[PDB]
Structure 1
Amino acid sequence: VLLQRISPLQIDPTIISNTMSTVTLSPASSILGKLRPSNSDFS
């Protein structure tokens, strides 16, 4: 938590969705469903 409250880096997982812009199964959507960028928990 001390390393969180100092660091300039913020972890912002919508960069993945912005590079994808996606929408059977497609491999572009399968990695989104596998990475789950809605989850904000990077402990």
Structure 2
Amino acid sequence: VLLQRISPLQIDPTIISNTMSTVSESTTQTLSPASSILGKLRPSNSDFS
């Protein structure tokens, strides 16, 4: 928390989602690698303590 008071960066999870929304898949397919990335990483949580 003493480092959170000081550190200049701010972790925003929107970067990885806004760059993985760029993928070009064919949708006639059960397997979704980009959605596997998103549902696996789960960027949308807080608390990177």
Same fold (TM over 0.5): yes
Higher helix residue share: 1
Which 5+ residue runs of structure 2 have no aligned equivalent? 24-29
Ranked by relative contact order (alpha carbons within 8 Å, sequence separation 6 or more), the top structure is 2
Percent sequence identity over aligned pairs: 100
**Aligned alpha-carbon RMSD (Å):** 1.8
Q: How many residues align?
A: 43
TM-score (norm 1): 0.84
- Return the index of the structure with the highest Cα Rg: 2
TM-score scaled by length of structure 2: 0.75
Structure 1 residue runs without a partner (length 5+): none
